[PDB]
């Protein structure tokens, strides 16, 4: 009858005025919001592309003092932390390296260093062997004491320890004024033929023995599969990790974005994506993994350091 209609019609004006014009509206906003997000991005890209017409350059001078190691440089009066030239192998040319003369007694030859995503670390095997990045930038005068992002080549590092075993020291800083260390009394990687297999010894510090103890926040085999010690270097284009050695889908380097002594992946992951602000989510990770400048033993898997660096010293 009449109300039979007043019923049907009632339950429709509903859906049409709410259930639809509601979804309808708060949808054309998200789609609209997304677009503007993309423009801000497209513009931010066009701007940087434009400003890359010319590469950057460091015209900073060169310290007269020098040596084999930075330790050697320290012994020679180099007491300021800045870019120096060293020559550990007399049959190889001297190369620029950033020396840390302040921390833990100085004499520290920085082999890797993060501090602003100024350098891409997702580089192939050839590149990680040769070295990449900027050792330092001009402080304004012409002294390169502003450390940059770089990976002194693995091969150099290898030769460095082959000549005579070194001790490594990791210095990391969070995005909140805190900083930890983690050094091993013995550092040494085998030759390339052996995938530059890592070999550290004797932990100490407050960051967490991530290298030979794995991420302590993991239990059982899970933990052990994050121990880097004894592992081989693996890169973008060269899987040598301990994760399904046959399945090429199980590549700790593809996901985790860095060349590193990945072992069924990791506890520590310097060389990873430089997420800004520290925290990042599985949703943001390129492969849903904990890629990023991670050091689980301290901030867990989803926090990217603001500063990370690997330093070598003899004795």
């Amino acid at each position: 009858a009449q109300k039979e209609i007043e019923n049907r019609y009632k339950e429709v004006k509903i859906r049409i005025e709410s259930t639809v014009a509601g979804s309808l509206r708060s949808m054309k906003s998200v789609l609209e919001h997304l677009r503007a997000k993309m423009q801000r991005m497209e513009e931010a890209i066009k701007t940087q592309k434009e400003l890359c017409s010319a590469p950057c350059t460091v015209n900073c001078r060169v310290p007269v003092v020098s040596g084999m190691h930075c330790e050697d440089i320290y012994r020679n009066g180099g007491r300021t932390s800045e870019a120096y030239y060293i020559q550990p192998d007399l049959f190889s040319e001297p190369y620029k390296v950033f020396c840390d003369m302040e921390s833990h007694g100085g004499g520290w030859t920085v082999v890797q260093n993060r501090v602003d995503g100024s350098s891409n670390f997702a580089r192939d095997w050839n590149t990680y062997k040769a070295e990449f990045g900027n050792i330092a930038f001009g402080n304004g005068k012409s002294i390169c004491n502003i450390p940059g992002e770089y990976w002194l080549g693995t091969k150099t590092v290898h030769q460095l320890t082959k000549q005579h075993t070194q001790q490594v020291l990791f210095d990391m800083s969070d995005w909140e004024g805190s900083s930890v260390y983690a050094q091993y009394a013995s550092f040494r990687p085998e030759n390339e033929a052996q995938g530059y297999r890592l070999w550290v010894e004797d932990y100490s510090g407050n960051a967490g023995n991530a290298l030979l103890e794995g991420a302590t926040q993991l239990m059982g085999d899970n933990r052990t599969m994050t121990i880097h010690n004894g592992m081989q270097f693996s890169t973008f284009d060269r899987d040598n990790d301990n994760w399904n050695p046959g399945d090429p889908t199980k590549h700790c380097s593809r996901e985790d974005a860095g060349g590193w002594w990945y072992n069924r992946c990791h506890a520590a992951n310097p060389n990873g994506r430089y997420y800004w602000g520290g925290i990042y989510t599985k949703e943001q990770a390129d492969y849903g993994t904990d890629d990023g400048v991670v050091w689980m033993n301290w901030k867990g898997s989803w926090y990217s350091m603001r500063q990370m660096a690997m330093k070598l010293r003899p004795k």
Binding site: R223, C252, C265
Partner: peptide, 4 residues
């Protein structure tokens, strides 16, 4: 972070 380990793997499966």
């Amino acid at each position: 972070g380990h793997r499966p």
